[PDB]
Amino acid sequence: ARQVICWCFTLNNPLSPLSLHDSMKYLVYQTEQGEAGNIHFQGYIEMKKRTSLAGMKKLIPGAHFEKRRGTQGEARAYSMKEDTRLEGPWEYGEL
């Protein structure tokens, strides 16, 4: 479907920590080391209601969103992995 609950994202060189907005049910993310000096948040979100790509882009400006691949557990694991982590993870809301 065009609108879905579950989304993964990265946010390159973020300016401040993320927040759980009222439209979001669950958020997990961490900070990872990228290449060429970049860093990024890597995260996973479950919205309270099915949301379009355009809606997600408004939710987190600057972030690259993709509809969740794989299972919930896999998406969470990918956003909590030790490999390249600099800080985090942080978990908000309810799975």
Domains (range + CATH), the chain = 1-95 (3.40.1310.20)
**How many residues in the chain?**
95
**Whole-number Å distance between alpha carbons of 5 and 86:** 28
- Verify whether residue 78 is a known catalytic residue: yes
Structure method: X-ray
C-alpha distance from residue 84 to each of 3, 17, 20, 27, 47 (Å):
31, 18, 24, 19, 26
Dihedral in degrees, nearest 10, Cα atoms 50, 58, 42, 68: 20
The residue from 26, 44, 78, 92 that is catalytic is: 78
CA atoms within 13 A on the CB side of 60: 30
CB 41 within 8 A of CB 10: yes
**Whole-number Å distance between alpha carbons of 50 and 7:** 10
